[PDB]
Design a protein around this ligand. Sequence first.
Ligand SMILES: NC(=O)C1=CN([C@@H]2O[C@H](COP(=O)(O)OP(=O)(O)OC[C@H]3O[C@@H](n4cnc5c(N)ncnc54)[C@H](O)[C@@H]3O)[C@@H](O)[C@H]2O)C=CC1
Ligand SMILES: NC(=O)C1=CN([C@@H]2O[C@H](COP(=O)(O)OP(=O)(O)OC[C@H]3O[C@@H](n4cnc5c(N)ncnc54)[C@H](O)[C@@H]3O)[C@@H](O)[C@H]2O)C=CC1
Ligand SMILES: NC(=O)C1=CN([C@@H]2O[C@H](COP(=O)(O)OP(=O)(O)OC[C@H]3O[C@@H](n4cnc5c(N)ncnc54)[C@H](O)[C@@H]3O)[C@@H](O)[C@H]2O)C=CC1
Ligand SMILES: NC(=O)C1=CN([C@@H]2O[C@H](COP(=O)(O)OP(=O)(O)OC[C@H]3O[C@@H](n4cnc5c(N)ncnc54)[C@H](O)[C@@H]3O)[C@@H](O)[C@H]2O)C=CC1
Ligand SMILES: NC(=O)C1=CN([C@@H]2O[C@H](COP(=O)(O)OP(=O)(O)OC[C@H]3O[C@@H](n4cnc5c(N)ncnc54)[C@H](O)[C@@H]3O)[C@@H](O)[C@H]2O)C=CC1
Ligand SMILES: O=CN1CCC[C@H]1C(=O)O
Ligand SMILES: O=CN1CCC[C@H]1C(=O)O
Ligand SMILES: O=CN1CCC[C@H]1C(=O)O
Ligand SMILES: O=CN1CCC[C@H]1C(=O)O
Ligand SMILES: O=CN1CCC[C@H]1C(=O)O
Lengths: 278, 278, 276, 276, 278
Amino acid sequence: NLYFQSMSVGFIGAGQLAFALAKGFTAAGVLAAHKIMASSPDMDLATVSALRKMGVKLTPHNKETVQHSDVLFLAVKPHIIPFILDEIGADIEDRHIVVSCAAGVTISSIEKKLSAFRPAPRVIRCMTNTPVVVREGATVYATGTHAQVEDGRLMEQLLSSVGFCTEVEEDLIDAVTGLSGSGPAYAFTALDALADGGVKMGLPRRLAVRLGAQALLGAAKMLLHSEQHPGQLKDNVSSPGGATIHALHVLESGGFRSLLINAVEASCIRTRELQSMA
Amino acid sequence: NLYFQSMSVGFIGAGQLAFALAKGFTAAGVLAAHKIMASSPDMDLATVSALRKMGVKLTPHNKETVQHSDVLFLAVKPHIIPFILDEIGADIEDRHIVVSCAAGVTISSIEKKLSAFRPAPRVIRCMTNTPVVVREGATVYATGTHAQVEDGRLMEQLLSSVGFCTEVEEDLIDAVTGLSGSGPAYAFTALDALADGGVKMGLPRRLAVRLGAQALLGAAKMLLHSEQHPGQLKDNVSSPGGATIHALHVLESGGFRSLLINAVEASCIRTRELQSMA
Amino acid sequence: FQSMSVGFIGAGQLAFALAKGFTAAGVLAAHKIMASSPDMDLATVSALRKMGVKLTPHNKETVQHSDVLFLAVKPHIIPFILDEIGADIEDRHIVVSCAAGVTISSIEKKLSAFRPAPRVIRCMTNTPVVVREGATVYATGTHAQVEDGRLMEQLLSSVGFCTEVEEDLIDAVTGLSGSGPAYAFTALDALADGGVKMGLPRRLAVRLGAQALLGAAKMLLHSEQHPGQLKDNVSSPGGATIHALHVLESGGFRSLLINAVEASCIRTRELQSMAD
Amino acid sequence: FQSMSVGFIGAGQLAFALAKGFTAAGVLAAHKIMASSPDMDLATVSALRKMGVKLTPHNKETVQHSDVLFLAVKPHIIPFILDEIGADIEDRHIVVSCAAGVTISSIEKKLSAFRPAPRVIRCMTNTPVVVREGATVYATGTHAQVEDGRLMEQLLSSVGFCTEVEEDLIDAVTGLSGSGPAYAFTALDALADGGVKMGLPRRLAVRLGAQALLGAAKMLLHSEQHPGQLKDNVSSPGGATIHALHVLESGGFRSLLINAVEASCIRTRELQSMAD
Amino acid sequence: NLYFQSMSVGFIGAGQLAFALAKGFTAAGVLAAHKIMASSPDMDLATVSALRKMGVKLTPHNKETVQHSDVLFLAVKPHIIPFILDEIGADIEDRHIVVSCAAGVTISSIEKKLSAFRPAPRVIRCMTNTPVVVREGATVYATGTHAQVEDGRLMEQLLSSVGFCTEVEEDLIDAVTGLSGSGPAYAFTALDALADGGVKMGLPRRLAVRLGAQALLGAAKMLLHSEQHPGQLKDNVSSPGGATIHALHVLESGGFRSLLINAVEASCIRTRELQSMA
Ligand SMILES: NC(=O)C1=CN([C@@H]2O[C@H](COP(=O)(O)OP(=O)(O)OC[C@H]3O[C@@H](n4cnc5c(N)ncnc54)[C@H](O)[C@@H]3O)[C@@H](O)[C@H]2O)C=CC1
Ligand SMILES: NC(=O)C1=CN([C@@H]2O[C@H](COP(=O)(O)OP(=O)(O)OC[C@H]3O[C@@H](n4cnc5c(N)ncnc54)[C@H](O)[C@@H]3O)[C@@H](O)[C@H]2O)C=CC1
Ligand SMILES: NC(=O)C1=CN([C@@H]2O[C@H](COP(=O)(O)OP(=O)(O)OC[C@H]3O[C@@H](n4cnc5c(N)ncnc54)[C@H](O)[C@@H]3O)[C@@H](O)[C@H]2O)C=CC1
Ligand SMILES: NC(=O)C1=CN([C@@H]2O[C@H](COP(=O)(O)OP(=O)(O)OC[C@H]3O[C@@H](n4cnc5c(N)ncnc54)[C@H](O)[C@@H]3O)[C@@H](O)[C@H]2O)C=CC1
Ligand SMILES: NC(=O)C1=CN([C@@H]2O[C@H](COP(=O)(O)OP(=O)(O)OC[C@H]3O[C@@H](n4cnc5c(N)ncnc54)[C@H](O)[C@@H]3O)[C@@H](O)[C@H]2O)C=CC1
Ligand SMILES: O=CN1CCC[C@H]1C(=O)O
Ligand SMILES: O=CN1CCC[C@H]1C(=O)O
Ligand SMILES: O=CN1CCC[C@H]1C(=O)O
Ligand SMILES: O=CN1CCC[C@H]1C(=O)O
Ligand SMILES: O=CN1CCC[C@H]1C(=O)O
């Protein structure tokens, strides 16, 4: 149904997130690549070359992206967002849905800037992650003061085409950022280290990478399809006296769990500072 | 459209692994549940009740499993394998392919036991993991002395229906056990801790669990479908000065990578003891 | 079990704890229990006297009175005891060894030199049998009749949890529930110190910490849910509990308790490796 | 207390735990209890329905039914609740706040704007009231009659330990027995992992570890002796237990539990510092 | 042959410290127990029952203690001192010497309270410790603005009967609190741990406790009676290659010395907060 809606989508910013979302949306068949336009003052990026190869329209002029779009994603660094809103705020129209993907930036700050121009800007804040590029993203969104009920449902339909999507209260989004926004990086670090461990124990690197990634994918999928606690799933792998429980002990002795808690906390706290500095 | 109409499968042992594989095989459609039989001296097990509901035939007698089966999975704890082989060795026939899933137990030790009863037993050793239950397992196998080329091909066909499967030299299997065999437990531990971090920062536990698992699944899928190094994918998530690179620093400060190397090593080393004692 | 006579070789902490639990339970009157020790001026001996237990310095007298005979001496003393009373075992006897680490095989070997078919059971229990909340496992020997294991389970269930195990599990049980009360007492003392640091009187802090641990343990015993699921019910988002759990994780709290069970289990095996 | 009607604002974990403990105790029939929550499709709501508790989406209905009204919503929601139902308090009412950190002063301030003399009690309890082994403290407000504190203690004693405290102790109690069950569940999971590492089946390891902690806590509650003296009774010289205690000490085990009580207490105060 | 026949002593507070001092004074023979009175709002205290058995007069009313007493010890918790001074300030007479034992509470704050009722209150501040109960305390005192020279001499005479006593400038007392006031607790902790070490190595607990305590008592006495540096005495016990120097190395490896410095510092710093808040 979204395809026949023939939506025009725009991205202010043409970097990693714009590429990941554009690739996921077109892979999902919801959007035609040429119905997406992205803007950036820097075309010498690999992301821009990849978007061009996809068939996405590219332009240096953010105003052109605004005029083209029905749904406008803000995909620039947090400190760039106020600059962006000053530049194209006069060009936001009643028809637009403005979707901010920027870490930390509040709906209130966005509506404050845009309401100086037209009085009821339709704003949605979201946080997502790069696995939308394989349509396995983890996305949350919050609706602003003037977003219609149909605006939230449209956003959920669009973002559900590239992974999990659910509405939340805005005060949860900084924490989501620390968990699933930054989460793929924690997983890539873990997969690299698990592969090093495989290689230390005699496996070829290529096989160690493949096996570790498949292990993590399958374990995550079991948890998503199970009602059981992750400790109960872990118990089903931990035979008495066996290999797994010996490995779990050395993780515990290093405070493995605490490091992952530290990471979510550190990303969430930094996300809050990215807003305060803007 | 795969289906083994002439294959009768039996499990010696009716525990977690027998349930995971039988559930995966029946979900994949490659085997009808009534062509599978499992034996265990304990029918008051939660996995026996679950196998019964699928339609798997069950018996207390290991000899009946052998007599019913062409492909015979040994799904008992490593120290039980020698008793099992003594019990049913005289019942092994030309048609049997014996597939040992036990951690650490060598092909040579199994062939030596079964050869006392009848020369040329057809033995395959495999290592898999519990995510075969959602058809996302990671499986390796090695062929024994008397396995025919068609036996390994058939086992790869069967095990590929529930996840990744590839042939390896037997001397890699203890290390695979430490990486992908124990791997799901490392992932469950990591997901439990990531959720704790989400809860600390204000997320409801249910949502934190869902988002953490979705982030790990998506990242693993990105790696499996990419030609790039986990570090390059990680670089795409680590914007300069951003939330993610701040979180990655606190992981590095605790030696996060070294803990996962420690874990693979400890599981691999213990697996070799679940045999050197044997 | 109404005409059953019970003896303890050794009149120390465990014999007191079991005899107190047994008599509180009603399953044994104190006058059916005898205990022996070479030192009648002991504190536990004085306590057993007050309860109505019969006391003798002579281990032979304990044996002649007893149907069920508990060995409650230190592990390195078991061989000496078996050499002293071996000629007095009488086929009516069930010999129940409580000593950490000492195998059924080593007991049957010493006793078989005197009479061929000694009925031996090995158990591991803990001091909370004194308030009838012990945790006990037992394994039956080569010549223990089926009714021997059943009588043992009837008796020990009166003072806490009791189940039969294979003998090769008992050293690990020792490291978990045998030593476990000491882990709990250490934890309770530290939790109380934490309460005192934040301004609670010591007596209130001890009471509250102990009541919290008892209640949580009961909750888990009465639940089918994973301990992590019960923990999630207490960890409200952003709240006080999840902040405390983080500082426990950061110190490797879980790993220390794993270390402890392991160290106790390994030492238990060592006590027997050096015995044999 | 036979014509006493009780309400809960909030129908979550604590309301379930208290209502289950109260009805198991016999002190309250389920039909004298009403609970309200904006989400009737909740798991705890479904459980309270099965027990016989009356449920409504409307907090005003809970207030009109109740004599004793428990506030069992998250701390940041208390001010909203008081603004919604303040005009409905009726002088027959005793308002019992269970929320972590929220002071009697802030509750009396919000309610006094509607009617001058609200009868307020603040308590801190824990989830083991669900098996009638909770640990509860309470402090009486400015307008709580003497009989108000006595009725409160009668009710909460039916589900565990209960004593009156000065309000300035309650944040510390929160860090000790309020959060304490989570420390115990974490410890029980780790002790079980230790049992499994040394070869025990998981189900046996969970049962034994939980039984050991329950029994030890009971022993201390029934003793006048210091927790170190009880620990000495388990630490035989050269034995398995003292080897395990050493590895706990070497990891700073005691300090981690002090850290935990402190961190929970401090966070509790912070939740109120940010409220006010 | 010391005895204060004209001195009536009172304690505001009837807890650990009042019991320790009254027991020490009566054991030293310098005061008859019936010339001592103590007040507390709680008679169900174990220290009240003990004071009663010695023959100390007891009352719930602090005003009666003041009216009976010449030397008045304030033996209540620091935050109770201002309430106490408000309650009985109007009852302070020319004859009274007010001796505050409360941690952290300054002479200036006590004189300011009592001066509102009657000018020139005679105030002494002391820090002592529980071993006065065995006449081996460590006590310091500072004299207030209106204390006469004979008041300090008399207090030194009295406090010397239960241990070491010396006059100090008031600004040393918070540090003395961290060293010898809290000191006995460090020693009890050390003795409990030394006994645990003896038990680990095979000693019965009773004997380990006796030997550890005797070793600490003897070593402290050697130092007090020697003109030599604790290091020189330590060198006499550390034979080359021997048992002791091996044990000293493992203490050094854990930073043993730094922990005790940390403790004195933490107690001193907290003591200053038990007043800066006041
Ligand atoms: N990379 C990720 O994993 C995710 C990123 N985000 C958020 O998405 C936003 C962008 O992140 P990345 O795309 O990773 O950054 P990136 O740095 O790859 O791309 C940034 C883009 O913005 C462009 N840009 C700079 N100034 C501009 C201007 N004045 N007008 C238009 N475009 C301008 C840059 O040229 C570049 O194309 C950030 O706010 C980040 O928090 C959120 C979810 C995940
Ligand atoms: N659980 C896992 O994650 C995986 C386990 N494995 C291997 O699978 C084997 C079994 O693992 P789980 O199924 O997890 O064990 P499990 O303990 O869940 O099931 C063990 C089964 O063996 C049965 N059994 C015991 N004695 C028997 C006998 N004499 N004859 C027949 N059945 C008997 C038990 O009753 C139970 O049904 C082990 O060797 C393990 O190394 C390999 C890969 C992953
Ligand atoms: N205390 C505990 O927490 C538990 C201890 N155990 C086992 O119980 C046994 C005893 O432990 P405790 O009772 O704690 O020791 P304990 O030292 O309190 O009592 C030992 C008793 O043995 C007596 N004894 C010494 N030589 C003797 C002899 N030749 N003949 C007779 N009695 C003699 C001593 O006089 C003393 O009364 C040990 O083997 C220990 O492993 C098992 C589980 C729990
Ligand atoms: N869970 C525990 O271990 C204990 C919790 N507490 C306190 O109990 C209070 C509740 O804790 P839990 O019950 O664990 O939270 P919970 O989240 O399980 O239940 C919270 C309930 O409040 C309801 N709620 C939300 N907004 C509401 C509104 N406007 N009107 C009425 N109900 C509303 C929710 O629907 C939910 O049913 C918190 O203040 C916590 O500090 C105190 C001691 C122990
Ligand atoms: N315990 C120690 O090791 C030493 C304590 N101190 C100081 O001694 C003072 C008391 O210490 P402890 O005796 O250990 O306290 P404690 O708590 O054992 O005794 C305190 C006494 O004060 C009483 N009290 C409370 N309110 C009162 C009031 N309004 N009027 C009269 N009495 C009242 C209590 O009932 C109790 O009898 C504290 O200021 C402490 O800093 C100084 C040196 C060492
Ligand atoms: O029991 C489960 N597993 C998973 C792989 C190895 C084996 C073990 O832990 O011994
Ligand atoms: O740039 C990528 N990401 C992922 C989530 C938040 C953002 C950051 O690190 O600031
Ligand atoms: O949510 C549960 N609890 C238990 C006591 C304090 C509160 C919290 O964690 O904030
Ligand atoms: O002495 C007491 N106990 C408890 C179980 C093992 C034994 C020991 O420490 O050796
Ligand atoms: O030389 C002194 N000492 C003291 C005790 C043992 C001996 C030593 O250190 O070897």
